[PDB]
């Protein structure tokens, strides 16, 4: 489960609300430590 | 992250050629649906 926000004002109105920067936890090499990462995903990959 | 400024991803088809190609197809479909009929195209309906 991962948290996301929209982008800029981006007032072009073609790309408004499209790119969805997200952040989540993800397991590293060692088993009992955690790694925090930032990425983004197009609008047809996430569902609230 | 995205460096620069964002647009859409788009495709171009030359309008003078694509008019001629639909003109050649619609002369051929008259042999299968009667000569006196006024052929109309449309968009896709729906689904996935």
């Amino acid at each position, epitope marked *: 489960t991962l948290q996301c926000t929209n*982008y*800029a*004002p981006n007032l072009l109105s073609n790309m408004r609300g499209e790119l969805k920067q997200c952040s989540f936890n993800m397991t590293t090499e060692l088993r009992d430590k955690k790694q925090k990462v930032y990425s983004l995903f197009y609008r047809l990959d996430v569902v609230q | 992250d995205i*460096i620069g400024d964002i647009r859409m991803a788009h495709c171009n088809v030359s309008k003078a050629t694509w008019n001629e190609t639909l003109g050649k197809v619609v002369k051929q479909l008259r042999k299968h649906f009667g000569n006196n009929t006024i052929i109309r195209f449309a968009q896709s309906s729906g689904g996935d």
Partner: antibody
Amino acid sequence: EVQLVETGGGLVQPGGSLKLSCAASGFTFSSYGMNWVRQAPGKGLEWVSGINSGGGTKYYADSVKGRFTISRDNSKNTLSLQMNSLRAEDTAVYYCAKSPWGQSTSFEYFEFWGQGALVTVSS
Amino acid sequence: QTVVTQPRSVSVSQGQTARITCGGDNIGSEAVQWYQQKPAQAPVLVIYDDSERPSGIPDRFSGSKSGNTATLTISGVEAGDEADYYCQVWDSSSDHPLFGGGTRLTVL
């Protein structure tokens, strides 16, 4: 060694203009969205005048809105801010900033600061 | 509009702990920085995204976002860490960066 060098004028009467310049002989400056903040010798901070890494958005605050501009010329590592109205004095110092995302907002911070903050006073 | 209040100039003296609290309206939208700054100096980032710190800062600084009021908890003192601290919690509905107030820290 990643730093910011600055030029800035002062003592401009309240009917003229002023142009500030922040330059960066450090990092790869073609990708990061630089910003501006202000501070009177007094209360605290106040935000103005953001931009992306292409010069295509350039959004502003609600107290300087529709009154100033931001130029951004790449390929020679130069930001150009141009204050042009100069209303009755909110005498404040100005800081040059850097945000390690580029392109946008929605959680943004500031790594390295430029601390060149010469003041508009209009005496 | 939307205020971010924090106490004016709290000062403990050699207790080796200090809790500069913050808060206001809807936190749960990234109470995000604290931004230590010393007089006639440059502001320096100290803690980003309220759990980690950048490389080059000693681990006397520690933040936590609890409920609706986040806070910064420093544990330990120094004769060169008397400075000013303030939140940067906002980005919504309006101008996205919005600093809030100030807080002076002195030890005796």
